[PDB]
Structure 1
């Protein structure tokens, strides 16, 4: 058994963490007090779920997780909510004053005063691991803390755990649910600073999750609770292989091996189906072929982009529920004969397929319907670079006028860091073009 440590940074990271850990508890049969009656080994064990939960002598199953925000208001809800008993207080770290949507305040000014405490609490968890694999880091691109503190933290984890894999779950900014003009600055600044420290990063565009909630869950104005429950379904699909018995993606290293041949091009596109409303009173259940087909519709992607106009470097399919290989292979043959799936020449054209028999779990009284089978596709396609283009365009528009730059300079960041990060983004777009397109 090999442990995974989850780190939730800033508002978005903390609330998504809440949704994920709630869902993991329901999937593993762990109650809000931490007891797991199905676990017959009291106070220890080397089961697959112990990759994410440790055990006390009293039978309490404790997430291997640290929550970190620079203001206290979001983590206090965890401290007083349904799962308050799940987490030890030393796992929940708050400052007094936040980064005000300012990367420089998160990374330099405020981050400098909490980083050692955070690394110490992380060390406390690591000392409880017998074979630490690495970290799952949850954060927004747009917040001052999610961007700047997260990048500071990633640098320090590279120093203190240089052999260990690090995965990100990153919330990409959308004007439909966000209230800040400077999110493009922070996103570009954090991606630049975190790139060579992250082995694999799953970006979730709030615009895509928003539209999925509106279209498929019939929600007029999705809230964070809706968005985070859907995101948590996708995260759970991704981590299920680390948390249950199985032979695919059983270690953090395998995500990079299977999905990332170019270390900088380490942003796989996630596509999830089916998303069905709990209120929909007549639902005809969807077959393997239909949901695997859904995997190739942009409307179901976590980032809106068009994979037909790029190239695949890797692709794999994580099924949950009633799925046998024969139906998967028939679906793939059909889709190959019907759709535009072009791989780069130096990677084989192929799918790695994982199937977990336990059906997807849903939150009782939630917005999602229980389904007999679901799938998450993780594909490394150059088309995801469209999101970088959008972000870079917005950066160029503001930076040409130096709009808002003084807030960052006044926290001690230099203007050169803006153009260094932006140059690095230009080189990233170039990498994706060279891999993905022909004259």
Structure 2
């Protein structure tokens, strides 16, 4: 009984989190009211990892919904699987965060953080053996970025020896709400560099290009972007929900404590020629292709420290090994040669809803430094002129704190750069 406590904070965090519980609830045969109605025991084997079992064989997700304004979580409560969440696990304010990291982390968020931790403590205490935590949020806003990182900090204080895992949506000027996103993202990345064991970097620009160029969606929406994040979140967690361990995963994926920012990938990504079968070579060629990755980083600009793949569906496991060992042995210049056998492959028999077989890609690549470089550049472009700083200094923050975040992220890039050589 290795339980995971899930937390979703802010607009992005709850909208992406909502669809995640909608996707896996479908895979485990849980309907919108928590009643199981599947046809396979594999669906219930690892069901307690993400679900609590209530009276009457009801399964309630182990999720804590957090936000500083009531709007988004009212949507979740009214959405498809809204009724499946525990009423007491909705913790929210009324002031909002104004896309301000200082408001979510020091002022507004600080007033609300304790009531969230009471709910976390309530869920952890009822866990037979808590694996760790997973947080979904964006870094470019205020609540999921500012307060999200405040939560991670207070969770690591109370549970220092539990794994802290996040799915983090990185800002991008292409799909950007406010100009202060570089500020909020830079301030959060430093928190994540210190207090998370694994962070899956999701770039809205990558999610956009996939929806535009690959999926052929003329006008992508946030909903379309979240469908990709749901499908990815379901893929990376397949090892945890079906017939392994968060700490075991971290051990084999993270060779250096600060370089724990992953690039995920999904395959297939077909446009509506959607019924055609996808051979194992196609799953493998696409899964490693940059166009299938959501970090908006060209892996051919760096090197993989470690790579993990999960294949879902009834396929030729012998042919899986042949194709994976073909991508490695045909591009080994992009894999560091000082970590032997740093490419691992796993198979799961249950495919996602509506796919005969799929493949999820998880890579610890030094190409991710390109993401932090872009953020660092946008940060400096405004900070050199102190543009929009008054929004943050008005919440008690000092310019010194910005100068440090800048340096912290530039040190992070220097660290990635040295292992790429």
Q: Indicate the TM-score class for this superposition, using the shorter chain for normalisation.
A: over 0.9
| Matched residue, 1:364 | none
Do residues 339 (structure 1) and 367 (structure 2) align? no
| Matched residue, 1:268 | 262
| Matched residue, 1:205 | 203
Structure-2-length-normalised TM-score: 0.96
Runs of 5+ consecutive residues of structure 2 not aligned to the other structure? none
Equivalent residues in 2 for 1:116-127, closer than 5 Å: 116-127=114-125
Give the Cα–Cα distance (whole angstroms) in 2 for the partners of residues 286 and 314 of structure 1.
Answer: 26
The alpha carbon displacement at 1:341 in A equals: 4.0
Equivalent residues in 2 for 1:295-334, closer than 5 Å: 295-334=287-326
Give the Cα–Cα distance (whole angstroms) in 1 for the partners of residues 407 and 57 of structure 2.
Answer: 52
Give the Cα–Cα distance (whole angstroms) in 1 for the partners of residues 301 and 37 of structure 2.
Answer: 50
Do residues 384 (structure 1) and 355 (structure 2) align? no
Deviations for 1:317-365, whole angstroms, at most 9, x for unmatched residues?
101112232111221243234335432232114421111111111xxxx
| Matched residue, 1:398 | 382
Give the Cα–Cα distance (whole angstroms) in 1 for the partners of residues 379 and 292 of structure 2.
Answer: 27
RMSD (Å) for aligned C-alpha atoms: 1.8
The alpha carbon displacement at 1:256 in A equals: 1.1
Judged with a 3 Å threshold, the aligned counterparts in structure 2 of structure 1 residues 423 and 291 are, in CA distance, closer, same or farther, namely same
- Find the residue that maps to 1:295 and give its secondary structure: helix
- Find the residue that maps to 2:164 and give its secondary structure: strand
| Matched residue, 2:251 | 257
| Matched residue, 1:224 | 222
Deviations for 1:70-108, whole angstroms, at most 9, x for unmatched residues?
000000111223323211211111100111111101101
Contact 2:22-2:80 at 8 Å conserved across structures: no
Contact 1:142-1:186 at 8 Å conserved across structures: yes
The count of residues paired between Structure 1 and Structure 2 equals 420
Contact 2:192-2:199 at 8 Å conserved across structures: no
The alpha carbon displacement at 1:402 in A equals: 0.3
- Find the residue that maps to 2:106 and give its secondary structure: helix
Give the Cα–Cα distance (whole angstroms) in 2 for the partners of residues 327 and 320 of structure 1.
Answer: 14
- Find the residue that maps to 2:84 and give its secondary structure: coil
| Matched residue, 2:109 | 111
Contact 1:388-1:429 at 8 Å conserved across structures: yes
2:402 to 418, 421, 434: 418
Judged with a 3 Å threshold, the aligned counterparts in structure 2 of structure 1 residues 322 and 38 are, in CA distance, closer, same or farther, namely closer
Out of 24-33 and 298-307, give the one that drifted further.
298-307
| Matched residue, 1:33 | 33
Contact 1:259-1:315 at 8 Å conserved across structures: yes
Give the Cα–Cα distance (whole angstroms) in 1 for the partners of residues 316 and 35 of structure 2.
Answer: 33
Runs of 5+ consecutive residues of structure 1 not aligned to the other structure? 362-369
Contact 1:188-1:422 at 8 Å conserved across structures: yes
Give the Cα–Cα distance (whole angstroms) in 2 for the partners of residues 116 and 39 of structure 1.
Answer: 41
| Matched residue, 1:130 | 128
Give the Cα–Cα distance (whole angstroms) in 2 for the partners of residues 40 and 324 of structure 1.
Answer: 21
Give the Cα–Cα distance (whole angstroms) in 2 for the partners of residues 155 and 350 of structure 1.
Answer: 31
Give the Cα–Cα distance (whole angstroms) in 2 for the partners of residues 337 and 56 of structure 1.
Answer: 50
Judged with a 3 Å threshold, the aligned counterparts in structure 2 of structure 1 residues 341 and 320 are, in CA distance, closer, same or farther, namely farther
Deviations for 1:108-139, whole angstroms, at most 9, x for unmatched residues?
11011101100001111112111011101000
Structure-1-length-normalised TM-score: 0.92
| Matched residue, 2:93 | 95
Contact 2:140-2:184 at 8 Å conserved across structures: yes
- Find the residue that maps to 1:338 and give its secondary structure: coil
| Matched residue, 1:289 | 281
- Find the residue that maps to 1:210 and give its secondary structure: helix
Contact 1:285-1:371 at 8 Å conserved across structures: no
Deviations for 1:272-311, whole angstroms, at most 9, x for unmatched residues?
111113x34x643221111111122211111122222322
Give the Cα–Cα distance (whole angstroms) in 2 for the partners of residues 408 and 310 of structure 1.
Answer: 35
- Find the residue that maps to 2:237 and give its secondary structure: helix
- Find the residue that maps to 1:218 and give its secondary structure: coil
Equivalent residues in 2 for 1:50-65, closer than 5 Å: 50-65=48-63
Contact 1:237-1:318 at 8 Å conserved across structures: yes
Give the Cα–Cα distance (whole angstroms) in 2 for the partners of residues 50 and 137 of structure 1.
Answer: 18
| Matched residue, 1:244 | 242
| Matched residue, 2:415 | 431
| Matched residue, 1:366 | none
